[PDB]
Design a protein around this nucleic acid. Structure first.
Ligand SMILES: Nc1ncnc2c1ncn2[C@@H]1O[C@H](COP(=O)(O)CP(=O)(O)OP(=O)(O)O)[C@@H](O)[C@H]1O
Ligand SMILES: Nc1ncnc2c1ncn2[C@@H]1O[C@H](COP(=O)(O)CP(=O)(O)OP(=O)(O)O)[C@@H](O)[C@H]1O
Ligand SMILES: N[C@@H](CCCC[NH3+])C(=O)O
Ligand SMILES: N[C@@H](CCCC[NH3+])C(=O)O
Ligand SMILES: [Mg+2]
Ligand SMILES: [Mg+2]
Ligand SMILES: [Mg+2]
Ligand SMILES: [Mg+2]
Ligand code: NA
Lengths: 506, 505
RNA sequence: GCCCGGAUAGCUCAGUCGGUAGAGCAUCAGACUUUUAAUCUGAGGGUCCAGGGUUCAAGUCCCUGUUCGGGCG
């Protein structure tokens, strides 16, 4: 009965504990790794038996074929590689020990094997064991699922099962670790200093993202989880550390969907005496070098709609394409839009609304010019942003805390990097004017309150730091999870997360 | 006066903004950093003037002094280095520009200087400016005083002021970052894989502490802040990743003092097919390497009650000492303590309490066996732990996640590294038995129901993961903040934290 | 809420027009000293989603109820 298998196995294990045959030994001295074993002894001719070499490996059994009463084949699997184990009685310690150990071994059990390298008559590298030791029995029936596990409910809720049964998961996570390591090395070589900013803030801020509210009993007050390390990074830049960076975890009290998580890892750096046009080249170098170092080339194949969907071949050649929002939008829509200075005026908002309705671009119930123009951009600019593209200048109406344009007016100093019709990186030229910063904070706090008592959603510590002099600096941020999704060919954020947050059962 | 100065400076800046003359320019191309400026143009002899080189640097005006109406020395400050912008009328663009820019710049203002490197008669490197541009005025008055500011509240609440006025803070933070960089390099070269475990868990667990409770809105469940990534790391090792590690943040809902913070960073790794004696050599190598790579030697001087206090000279020579927590306690105390290897009855607790009374020590009001024996070991085996020292094994009752000792009973496979009488890292041989782990979880839950706020709950997902088979593993955890405190001669956790949590005053 | 189609061993499907529960996979036992998704030999495992009427006899004729899935709101 498959349902009672666990119980039966448990009983057997209990018996092994009763009669002094503890199936959980404290230590097994593994001499060589499976990868090193395979690399070293792959040259052996078929039929070889290195009787003069003794090695101790360890791994989980993934198969068990009984070709006879004295000849059994196991398939150790570990470190992403497999190794056959040719349990033969004539090469074992004794026949009784052989049958005793082989009567207690099942699939999924973690065992240690001591024996001699060799190759079968079919040219399969294996290890003839002098003695097999049981290290950790598997009490649950491990399925023999050909083509791997495919149910996307035990894959995410039981990540260990996904790792055991599916091999691409390990590669997906190794790629993410390599991505983070490459970013760290790049920024450190550039001269940056990695910092750790508080994840719990007294104030939530004026941002629209919903925060996570905790309660500190010792200090008898509420604590808000981090949304961005923005303000503390800028306070450090005020202090004197010109170049800072942090790869950290931000929290958001929003919904859980295909491409969202309550907690996510983002990279953010800030450098003094620069601007967004200076960060353009740094972003080009970082992204192109990361792609070259991870995938081994500048071309990446991505499937936005699963393996059966369309395949897109993006090219990360270092000269990324750069386009301005206003000019490219003029070229795409054909018609010219009113001048930027009149972006705040209502007639601009209405002429944008009329033309977007003419193009059937659905917008949220708030019909402010910001929503309309960002929808226009997303519907007629990101559509063509398959290869990485640099949107070069955005209007001030979506962008607070960013300096005004050097020559233009009403346009913020920002760029965005779009790969596969999705933004991965953004950067801004900082607003170091304490008066303008305070005015924006007040306005956004009043907007966030939306008729409430207000007098909050601000950081008087930050507005006091800026009054001490913040050098003209530039900030850059990027989503780690989206980059990992684009580099591991995953269209779901849960595929690049070890333990994604899932809805509770029942 | 500071309010008056702020009012006057703000009025002046507003008047400047009215008639053009933006005091916040968008871009200033810094050609060479200050450190490179000192490194390169230091071979000059006093009285040299490289009129054929023009460089644009930037910094903050720490001090502005004038010697005559046509000669004024500013003291630029940058990445921990000090320049000296010696500005004069003859080599400036114009005299009118000279006195128009001299009456506007004050202390603390961030400026950019485009000029020729040189050296005066006295012999300190300077830059003769052709044009000075104000980049960011400092509205408030920087407190001008020697030795920096000593007000701990001001330094901790306003870290930017501490960085501006005090230089050793930058050194402390550089050292703290180098610690984490070296740990990552050491673990990566050993084959470990860096991972990111969730910071919010449905049920509390991971380590003995009190958690932070949140409330997800869309999904109606109550989330809990992380205390340790231990369980997730062990499930990942079950999955097949032999070696994992993570340098992350843990949250405690407890008090704040000189050594405790609500959020703190710790490094945890787990390696399969290893025991707690396989991590002692690794720990020796990692700690000695960190000390030698940062300090430059194996000898470190530490002041535990302030620099004015006595200095203790610890030595990090790789052969660290090794001590047994029960055997050496027996040797030093004098008498035979209760056997406790197979005796966990109330008699053991009572005789422990009698020993505590006889030894003149203070014990927690719960007076339980674990707390007692913890007081006994801490007060009798820790005074002579100046140099780094290992603790071979600890009784099982203070070990709900460590495998039992292979030879002795009641003891567990658990060592602890102590430097300067404080634990930095501790490692376990992890318990891979599902039945024993379930039993220990049940005891912890029963203790919590009995009124133990520091007990964990039972996690059935981890129990199932163990039921699927966990290899013989060893786990290791280290407190980064305490190590940074030791390596920076800092006796307060606030000194090694960028923005420590303080009273809402 | 209305209509339609399934409710069958542990899982996936036959069971045809009733003459009765079968096949594969999963588990257990046996055979085989060179397998690789090893292969053969069997065993257990259901009570046919539930209750009624037709029929000598109905999972396999029909009517209700429960659930799931799809469409229609
Ligand atoms: N749930 C989530 N998971 C991961 N990253 C998230 C996230 N929510 C926000 N972000 C970050 O925010 C960036 C831009 O999104 P934001 O405008 O800040 C919030 P959003 O509106 O929910 O996302 P969207 O604009 O991508 O639709 C992303 O690239 C990512 O870095
Ligand atoms: N609130 C906190 N702030 C900073 N570091 C903390 C901390 N709580 C624990 N740590 C660190 O976590 C590591 C292990 O701490 P523990 O030994 O579990 C503390 P404890 O013994 O439970 O309580 P105690 O610190 O009040 O004696 C050490 O590096 C310690 O400094
Ligand atoms: N936090 C910002 C940096 C720019 C800040 C501009 N005031 C980002 O990641 O985009
Ligand atoms: N990381 C835990 C325990 C370390 C040993 C884990 N096997 C702690 O510091 O408390
Ligand atoms: Mg956007
Ligand atoms: Mg982004
Ligand atoms: Mg301790
Ligand atoms: Mg510790
Ligand atoms: Na069969």
């Amino acid at each position: 009965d498959p349902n009672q298998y666990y119980k039966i196995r448990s009983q057997a294990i209990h018996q092994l504990k009763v009669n002094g045959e503890d199936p959980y030994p404290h230590k097994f001295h593994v001499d060589i790794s499976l990868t090193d074993f395979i690399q070293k002894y792959s040259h052996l001719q078929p039929g070889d038996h290195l009787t003069d070499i003794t090695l101790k490996v360890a791994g989980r059994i993934h198969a068990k074929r009984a070709s006879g009463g004295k000849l059994i084949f196991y398939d150790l699997r570990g470190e992403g590689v497999k190794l056959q184990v040719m349990a033969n009685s004539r090469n074992y310690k004794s026949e009784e020990e052989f049958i005793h150990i082989n009567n207690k071994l099942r699939r999924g059990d973690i065992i240690g094997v001591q024996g001699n390298p060799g190759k079968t008559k079919k040219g399969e590298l294996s290890i003839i064991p002098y003695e097999i030791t049981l290290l950790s029995p598997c009490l649950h029936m491990l399925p023999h699922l050909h083509f791997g596990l495919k149910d996307k409910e035990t894959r995410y809720r039981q990540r260990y099962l996904d790792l055991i049964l599916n091999d691409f998961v390990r590669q997906k996570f190794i790629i993410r670790s390599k991505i983070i390591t490459y970013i760290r090395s790049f920024l450190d070589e550039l001269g940056f200093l990695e910092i750790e900013t508080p994840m719990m803030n007294i104030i939530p801020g004026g941002a629209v993202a919903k925060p996570f509210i905790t309660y500190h009993n010792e200090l008898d007050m509420n604590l808000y989880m981090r949304i961005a390390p923005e303000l503390y990074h800028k306070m450090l830049v005020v202090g004197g550390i010109d170049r800072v960076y942090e790869i950290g975890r931000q929290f958001r009290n929003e919904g859980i969907d295909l491409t969202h998580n309550p907690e996510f890892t983002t990279c953010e750096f800030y450098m003094a005496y620069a601007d967004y046009h200076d960060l353009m080249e740094i972003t080009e170098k970082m992204v192109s070098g990361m792609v070259k170092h991870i995938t081994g080339s500048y071309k990446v194949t991505y499937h936005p709609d699963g393996p059966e969907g369309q395949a897109y071949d993006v090219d990360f050649t270092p000269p990324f394409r750069r386009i301005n929002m206003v000019e490219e939008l003029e070229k795409a829509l054909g018609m010219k839009l009113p001048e930027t200075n009149l972006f705040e005026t209502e007639e601009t908002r209405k002429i944008l609304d009329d033309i977007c309705v003419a193009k059937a671009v659905e917008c949220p119930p708030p019909r402010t010019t910001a929503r309309l123009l960002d929808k226009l951009v997303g519907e007629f600019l990101e559509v063509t942003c398959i290869n990485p593209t640099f949107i070069c200048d955005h209007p001030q109406i979506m962008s607070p805390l960013a300096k005004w344009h050097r020559s233009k007016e009403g346009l913020t100093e920002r760029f965005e990097l779009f790969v596969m019709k999705k933004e991965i990186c953004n950067a801004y030229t900082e607003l170091n004017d304490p008066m303008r910063q305070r005015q924006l904070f007040e306005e956004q706090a009043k907007a966030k309150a939306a008729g409430d008592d207000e007098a909050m959603f601000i950081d008087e510590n930050f507005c006091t730091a800026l009054e001490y002099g913040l050098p003209p600096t530039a900030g850059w941020g990027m989503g780690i999870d989206r980059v990992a999704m684009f580099l591991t060919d995953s269209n779901n954020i849960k595929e690049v997360l070890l333990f994604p947050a899932m809805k509770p059962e029942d």
